Structure 1
């Protein structure tokens, strides 16, 4: 599923991301835009052999089992394929563990480089929430 901006914002708010660990909804929407272009099916291979999965490009190195990432952890206790569903519940629940883990949203390279210290409120302007 390729989400609309306001469609995703509404889904993220419902799934408990608005101000999660102090990160406004616009932060999560901006991260999703630059990570996946709002596409639940997005996959990208990392140079280390790990793969990033879904709307927030969660990494098989630490967070999910994809059957092909040797000596990696599965800290969200899920198959990485669960992160590609048109239902974002598994991505949201895993993102909550990631962002709680001490580095906050700096875990997302696209967030640090493209969203951090920007006017992220612009990502939710116009949306019915």
Structure 2
């Protein structure tokens, strides 16, 4: 499912990402925009045999089980397929663990590259939250 921008912002706010760990909602909307272009079925291989899944491109080496990643741990205790759902609940709950894992939102490379330090309020422009 391709989310609209404000559709996603509303779902992320309902699930508690606004200001979570000190990161405003626009940070999370920005992250999803550049991680997945708001496409809940986005999947991208990394070299290390891991894969990033879903709206927030969560990695199969530590966080979810895809059954093909060597040395995998599954710290969110889900198949990675659960992160390709049309509803974002699994992704959000796993994201909250990742952002608490010692690096804040620096866990999301596209967020670091394209959102960090920018005017992230623009990502909630026009959203009636």
- Smaller-chain TM-score bracket: over 0.9
Q: Shift of residue 12 of structure 1?
A: 0.1
Partner Cα separation in structure 2 for residue 96 and residue 26 of structure 1? 15
Q: Aligned partners of 2:34, 2:19: CA distance in 1, in Å?
A: 20
Return the offset for 1:73: 1.0
2:44 equivalent in structure 1: 44
Q: How many residues align?
A: 129
> What is residue 34 of structure 2 aligned with on the other side?
34
How far apart are the structure 2 equivalents of 1:6 and 1:116?
Answer: 20
CA distance in structure 1 between the aligned counterparts of 2:23 and 2:85, rounded to whole angstroms: 24
Which consecutive aligned stretches of 4+ in structure 1 deviate over 4 angstroms post-superposition?
none
Deviation digits for residues 36-80 of structure 1 (CA, Å, limit 9, x no counterpart): 000000000001110000000000011000010011110101000
State the TM-score, normalized to the length of structure 1: 0.99
Between the aligned partners of 1:102 and 1:67, the Cα distance in structure 2 is 26
Q: Extract unaligned runs of 5+ from structure 2.
A: none
SS in 2 for 1:118: coil
CA distance, structure 2, for counterparts of residue 101 and residue 16 of structure 1: 17
| TM-align CA RMSD | 0.4
What is the alpha-carbon distance in structure 1 between the residues aligned to residue 95 and residue 5 of structure 2? 18
Deviation at 1:17, TM superposition (A): 0.4
Structure 1 position 126, deviation (Å): 0.6
After superposition, the C-alpha distances for 1:109-129 in whole angstroms (9 at most, x for unaligned) are 000110000000000011010
TM-score by length of 2: 0.99
The 1-side partners of 2:80 and 2:71 are apart by 15
User: 1:5 & 1:52 partners in 2: Cα distance?
Assistant: 21
